[PDB]
Amino acid sequence: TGIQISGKGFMPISIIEGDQHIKVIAWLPGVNKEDIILNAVGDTLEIRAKRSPLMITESERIIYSEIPEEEEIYRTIKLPATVKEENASAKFENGVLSVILPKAESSIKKGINIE
Amino acid sequence: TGIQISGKGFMPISIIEGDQHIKVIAWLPGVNKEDIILNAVGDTLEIRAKRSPLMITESERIIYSEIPEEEEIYRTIKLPATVKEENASAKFENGVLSVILPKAESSIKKGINIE
Amino acid sequence: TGIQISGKGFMPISIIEGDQHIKVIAWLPGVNKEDIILNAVGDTLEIRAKRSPLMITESERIIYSEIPEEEEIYRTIKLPATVKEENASAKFENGVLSVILPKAESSIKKGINIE
Amino acid sequence: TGIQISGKGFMPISIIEGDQHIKVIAWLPGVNKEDIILNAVGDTLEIRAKRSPLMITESERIIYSEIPEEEEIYRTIKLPATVKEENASAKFENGVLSVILPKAESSIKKGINIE
Amino acid sequence: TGIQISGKGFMPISIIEGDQHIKVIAWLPGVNKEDIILNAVGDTLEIRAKRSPLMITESERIIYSEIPEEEEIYRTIKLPATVKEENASAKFENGVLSVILPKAESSIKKGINIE
Amino acid sequence: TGIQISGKGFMPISIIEGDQHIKVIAWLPGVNKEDIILNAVGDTLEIRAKRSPLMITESERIIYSEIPEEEEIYRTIKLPATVKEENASAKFENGVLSVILPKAESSIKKGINIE
Amino acid sequence: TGIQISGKGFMPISIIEGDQHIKVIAWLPGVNKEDIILNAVGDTLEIRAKRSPLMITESERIIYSEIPEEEEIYRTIKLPATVKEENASAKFENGVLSVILPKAESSIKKGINIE
Amino acid sequence: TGIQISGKGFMPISIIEGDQHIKVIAWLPGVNKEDIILNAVGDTLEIRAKRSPLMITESERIIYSEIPEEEEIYRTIKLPATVKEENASAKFENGVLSVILPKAESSIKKGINIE
Amino acid sequence: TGIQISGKGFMPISIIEGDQHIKVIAWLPGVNKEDIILNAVGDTLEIRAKRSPLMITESERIIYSEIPEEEEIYRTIKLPATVKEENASAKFENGVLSVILPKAESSIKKGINIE
Amino acid sequence: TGIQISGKGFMPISIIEGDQHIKVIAWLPGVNKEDIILNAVGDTLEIRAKRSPLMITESERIIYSEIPEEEEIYRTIKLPATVKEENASAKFENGVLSVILPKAESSIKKGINIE
Amino acid sequence: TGIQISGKGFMPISIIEGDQHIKVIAWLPGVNKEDIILNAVGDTLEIRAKRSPLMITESERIIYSEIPEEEEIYRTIKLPATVKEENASAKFENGVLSVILPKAESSIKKGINIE
Amino acid sequence: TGIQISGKGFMPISIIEGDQHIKVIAWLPGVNKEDIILNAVGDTLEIRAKRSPLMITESERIIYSEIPEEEEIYRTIKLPATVKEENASAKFENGVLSVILPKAESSIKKGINIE
Amino acid sequence: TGIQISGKGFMPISIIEGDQHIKVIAWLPGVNKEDIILNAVGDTLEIRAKRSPLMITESERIIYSEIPEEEEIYRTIKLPATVKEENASAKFENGVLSVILPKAESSIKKGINIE
Amino acid sequence: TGIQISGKGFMPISIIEGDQHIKVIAWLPGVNKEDIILNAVGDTLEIRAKRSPLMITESERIIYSEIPEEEEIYRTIKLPATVKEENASAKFENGVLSVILPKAESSIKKGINIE
Amino acid sequence: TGIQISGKGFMPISIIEGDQHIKVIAWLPGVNKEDIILNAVGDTLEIRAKRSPLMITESERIIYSEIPEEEEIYRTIKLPATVKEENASAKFENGVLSVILPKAESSIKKGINIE
Amino acid sequence: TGIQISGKGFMPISIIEGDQHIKVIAWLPGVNKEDIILNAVGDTLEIRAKRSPLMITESERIIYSEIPEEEEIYRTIKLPATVKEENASAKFENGVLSVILPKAESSIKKGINIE
Amino acid sequence: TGIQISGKGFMPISIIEGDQHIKVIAWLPGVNKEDIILNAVGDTLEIRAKRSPLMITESERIIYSEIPEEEEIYRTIKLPATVKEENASAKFENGVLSVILPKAESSIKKGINIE
């Protein structure tokens, strides 16, 4: 399986391969649904997102923090099969994005008989 | 500011202190609202959560993954002020939890005049 | 959870916290029941014990040993809650001591509603 | 004295040799008497045991622990003398096991006169 | 020759290239014939297998072992030529699997004359 | 348990001890049944085998290999009990050899009563 | 994004990807416009240039220098998309070269709807 | 320029790229012309050769040597352009082999005008 | 055997000593026969050669190279015997030079009888 | 010769093997004759001793010392032959102990003729 | 195979095990036949030898030497089988000693049938 | 206390100082009484001794040894007080030598009163 | 004394120089007398030998070995004097070769008178 | 070419070998012509020189210096050919000495024909 | 004394300061007098030179060399006093250049009286 | 100057070369004149000596020593010229030996004229 | 024994102590008898010497040297006993000086009786 991942930001990724489709799971906590861009062609997928920073009053101040302040995040993924992007689907729930991509006919493997 | 953090799992935390309240922000992507337990007394707050693992069919398999598989997560936080837990509030949205805690009368600071 | 452990000897310890009580488990192999002293006040517990050494005849001698020969052992434990020591209980069986300590009213945490 | 020790788990051991017998002392805190298996032949002794794990309610949780969670423990010991296993005896008290093994006639040493 | 190997488990591999075919040899000791899955398309081959673990009675126990206990094993191989999977063959004997894959017409090399 | 292993080649081994017998499991992928020699006496077992090397045509060549080319393999094993070799049995299946060896009367251990 | 850069000399490069085109910026200080060669096909671009060395009189001499004296410079770039070279354009100004390359129809990505 | 070299033996290589062809130069001292195999397809070239070892009489012996004794040598080369192998040519002289390979129409680059 | 080698360039050497002659083998790939100078006197041999560099057109360029560009090469060899240079011979074939040198009468060794 | 030495204290040892007996020499300076215990069976010998410490008056004090103050000393020795302990003898003189042990009939070696 | 080697001097050793005998080969250059002592019992063999030192005249002196000057040499070998020393044989030729030792009936291994 | 010790061999020493005398204890195991030389003058003492080496028969040999083979031993001791050597005494028993040396009048210390 | 040693194999050497001759001693255990070649001229000596390898039956196998398996051995020695090879002699006994070489008249040193 | 250089001082050297002569170049700045000694015999050359030190007045002093103050300098050179010293010549100019040495007839090399 | 030296090549320098002048000595072996340029102004001096390289015939070659082949050499020196360049002088002899520079009136130091 | 020194012992050496002779100085303190052997031939010199060891009475002993106890000492020296040993001379005084060796006619160097 | 050595130069020293005298041996090669100064008082000895340096002619020069060129040498020695310098004696022979010093009455040691 040839996998290429590139981009910037904090975004953990899981890839699941079946016999006839591919599933991608991405973690995007704090991002609105209307600020995500998803694109795909051939064997390549592209995810882009923005998250708004934490807004404080001037009376308030941050005394402890582990949450990063990158505003723009993106990933480019090269997949081990050619997909059909016209039949794909996606869902966003509790800050998790799930993409389902059906495989093309020329990438579906065939069985060999053992004796 | 005396801050104590302990627990287990993956859970980034931000603490914001104002003049009359304290705000806590926690990242919990993939957790249902009905699986969170929030408790507070004195100057101590406790957050407990469960996230369901990723369910696959036996035809499918995971070829790449960066998402951790801990099932139980919790944090215990000791705060720099005594709060009133009977007036507190919380919100859960896009996988982010936000807690607002009002301060007690014996922890509100008073000004000194400079000349 | 603020935990402080100090003392001397060999004595493994487990601490279990519930919603309304605290349980402590201690390993004391070879100690008689009438040679244990247990005390508690506030948020502090104290365990003291003696074990008799191995008595041999002058015809006999020790050719191999991994068992330590400390005679006095004790632990002092500072707990994350204030307990009521007048309602506590303890049991000793197969060399294991188990202590149950009920929590005070000012240390019982209260729930916050999420919406 | 040729001594061989092997096995798995946590089990400290002491060996005492006299003129006509051998004594073995083992530390087994938390084990029931009916879950110990003792065997011996020739110059070899075998001890097997099980200890039940710590059972909690789902309201409770373990915040500190030094007690190990191995469930099966055993030791195999090769001794410096041939014993008679038909005359041996054993005792279990406060989590300590004590085994007494009489020596065979062909392993009892004889004195040489000095002048 | 571009060769890509990925997967999990213990499975040694040999690849042999001729003028008109490719041969793959894999070591699978302890696997039943009906628990192997072989697939191929384009220039990629996929081998999946399961081996049952070693079953003991509770009187018996394992005192020495060098054999690994992974239950699921697989390999994905990217080959230096495009093959025809409809003419391929495979054999399984003494725990060794042998796969023969004929080459496509567009991957058969042609000679150049030297003078 | 006194275990001695020596020899040459690639041959993983598992040893299982019961109350009245000993089992040995060996991995020999690629070896014919008629090329194995098994011997035993006292507390010692001996396994010898040959595997034929991989035969190629001069048009073919090996471009990748992880399979070793030792031709002669053997193991000598010293066991923790004296066996009866006249009652032993062996099986060879899918490249795995399994040997069952009954114990002699002078190596069967006897129980000691605990009180 | 698969990017391959090779060549020789001093030539800093920037690559900008849009939705429908690719832009390349190169730094070539001291090079005449009529000494640049630009070529492209498929997903590959090639830049070649010459710069004349610094000409001095024999009365003059160089007492300090940080400017390199390579005479031939070139870069070969492999791009993450297939372009149409018949619609490309280029500009040279103040020693900076800018190339605009339109994308082919088979490399333009398509959107997936999220719900 | 994507270049891949693999193989075994001693064989220095030079690659020259023009506008419409590719030239490869290889050093093979001591090899007969009738013991060289040259093949090419797509963007890949393959060179195979044998050299006879140095034959001595039993009266003679080698007291100093820097010449290696590998008998089989080969190289596989992946080129940065697709060639036409039906129009290629080769020459062998003084132990040097020279191969000329014409480029295909889809790999010939086109010029871009600068203004 | 006293052997001295000196010179410059790339030139591997083998020396073979018999009972009545000495043979020298040298690797010179790419050198014309009319550009070699061979000299010998006493116990010293001298080899000098030139190789023409690789000539390219200005459209062409070298993108990969392992072949060295030294133009002048020579070796001086001091031998373990005095030779007769008036009876020597040499051959040049496939880029390999072979020199045969007969030994003088004062360097031919004589046998000693063993009893 | 299989030799095993174990014990505690300061006691240098020499072992001398003849054709029909074994001699052991031990250094015990400062030990009374009536405080030594010597035992032997099979192929094992055991030496035990006590030495009284240095007694001072309270006016006196030790300003320099290299003599050790261990009070109990012992050695256990496993020999390379089976002896007859009923025919052994021992002597003590100037702080040196000498033990003579005759060999059993089954440990006396026999000669092989060379031709 | 349990092998124990001990002794002093320079004496290389080879051990060969068959089905019914054991062979030992020892290198003793410079030793007379009448100065070798060979003994064996049980599973133990003993070789003792003396070699005379190099005798020079006072006019002569040693300007270079690699030959050691130990005068007494011996080896003790513990074998992996019990032998019959009354049927053994030995030969001495060109400074090499060869010993043949037949095996006892209780050390000859028996075959196990595989199915 | 100024103490100087010098000499050669193995000889442990203890020095005891009182109010009116000095005691020296030396360990000499294996030395005859008639082979000791004791001398003293001023503040210096001298001990010289010989021990006979271990005498073996040519049938016997030493297979293990920790006892040193120095034949001559001596110590020179410079003391922190001037003694009277005409009133000194010495004893030899079980390999231990004890010397008593009375102090001179000019080295006896006098008390100072504290108030 | 100028000494040069070269060659291959295992062969220890001693060189002894007198007033009128030179002696060489070589260790060759396991070599037949008819397989040695000795030559000398000027100030150079040459020793060549072969030893047959250890021949086993297929029932037998080598379980331990320290004896090397080089088949061809030789040494070349350059001496500090010119010898007369027509008066030399050699002996072979118990695997040791001894060569005596008389000196030439031009290498015999002459005395200088001291006053 | 056997070259030996020895001596003391600062004197850089160049050696040039032709077909019939040898040239030596030496750097001697600050040396008068009448203070050089040149000698040669066989294959050895010897150069000796003196340079006067820098003379100052007592008003003057040296505040910086890199020029060395050795007064005597010499070199001894062993050459790779025997020369005729009766036909040699030398020149001294601008502090550089040049020596030309013709070769003897027995060191002039002769050509070997190649075919 | 402020001294600054810069430039390139091999040129050792000595600087001598008096009461009324400055002397500079430079080593230039192999340089012609008509190829030196000397300049001075203020407190700065500049020396420039060329040396011709060593010219050989094509029959000749350089087998050893320590003389450097830089062709252009120069030094710039900043002096600790202001000089009058219109009264300066220079000499060149045996490859050594000597420059005398008179001091200006404003750099001549004046004495202070001590009492 | 080719100098070779070899031998054993303590013997410092100085070598002085003139135009027509060679001088050697050696330090031999404690050696009698009648125990020195001096030899020379060609270009080689040989010095041999004995010194008697230090003789003590049994009442006396050595408490400090820096003088070495080698009894035999020798040096072999290879000189840079051929000498005439029939005209040599030697002197011995205060433990210093001085040897004068005249040079042969073929080693006397001849002058070359410089212009 | 308190020994103090100080001074400068090369001078090895040996000190021998008897019952009634002290002997000192010093190595002074190359020193005349009339250039030595010997002094002693109390427990201290002083040796002073001069050696003339090696005198050469200006035709001669030193090409190798290990002999040091210190001109003044001396040693001061503090002894472990008070001597009588009016009864001392000294000898000088072959470059070795020997001094005999009788002991005073207050340093002669007295014996102590052992029982």
Side-chain angles (χ1 to χ4, degrees), chain P residues 15 17 19 59 61 64-65, chain Q residues 14-15 17 19 59 61 64:
Chain P
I15 308 175
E17 195 206 278
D19 275 305
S59 173
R61 69 271 185 192
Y64 184 76
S65 196
Chain Q
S14 288
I15 308 175
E17 195 206 278
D19 275 305
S59 173
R61 69 271 185 192
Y64 184 76

Side-chain angles (χ1 to χ4, degrees), chain E:
Chain E
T1 65
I3 302 295
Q4 269 180 202
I5 317 287
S6 82
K8 74 187 284 289
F10 176 79
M11 201 200 289
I13 288 290
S14 288
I15 308 175
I16 292 156
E17 195 206 278
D19 275 305
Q20 287 197 269
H21 71 288
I22 293 172
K23 196 169 297 166
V24 184
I25 291 95
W27 266 13
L28 301 164
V31 177
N32 270 300
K33 188 187 287 180
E34 302 84 0
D35 295 354
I36 310 168
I37 300 169
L38 257 178
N39 291 297
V41 80
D43 59 326
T44 309
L45 181 85
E46 174 57 24
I47 310 166
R48 282 186 273 159
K50 325 166 167 280
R51 49 165 66 108
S52 302
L54 164 66
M55 285 281 192
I56 64 168
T57 313
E58 66 274 14
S59 173
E60 316 172 334
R61 69 272 185 192
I62 301 176
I63 63 174
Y64 184 76
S65 196
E66 301 167 18
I67 286 159
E69 285 328 68
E70 55 255 10
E71 206 268 330
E72 277 311 326
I73 50 179
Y74 77 97
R75 280 305 183 278
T76 301
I77 300 147
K78 182 172 258 186
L79 298 168
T82 291
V83 308
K84 312 184 284 193
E85 70 268 27
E86 67 263 18
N87 293 353
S89 53
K91 270 156 182 153
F92 193 49
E93 169 182 356
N94 296 319
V96 177
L97 176 77
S98 291
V99 193
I100 298 178
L101 299 163
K103 280 187 181 171
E105 292 292 327
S106 64
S107 291
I108 286 155
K109 289 216 195 61
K110 296 179 181 292
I112 310 160
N113 283 1
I114 315 177
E115 59 92 19

Side-chain angles (χ1 to χ4, degrees), chain G residues 6 33 38-40 76 85, chain H residues 1 19 108-112 115:
Chain G
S6 82
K33 188 187 287 180
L38 257 178
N39 291 297
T76 301
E85 71 268 27
Chain H
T1 65
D19 275 305
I108 286 155
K109 289 216 195 61
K110 296 180 181 292
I112 309 160
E115 59 92 19

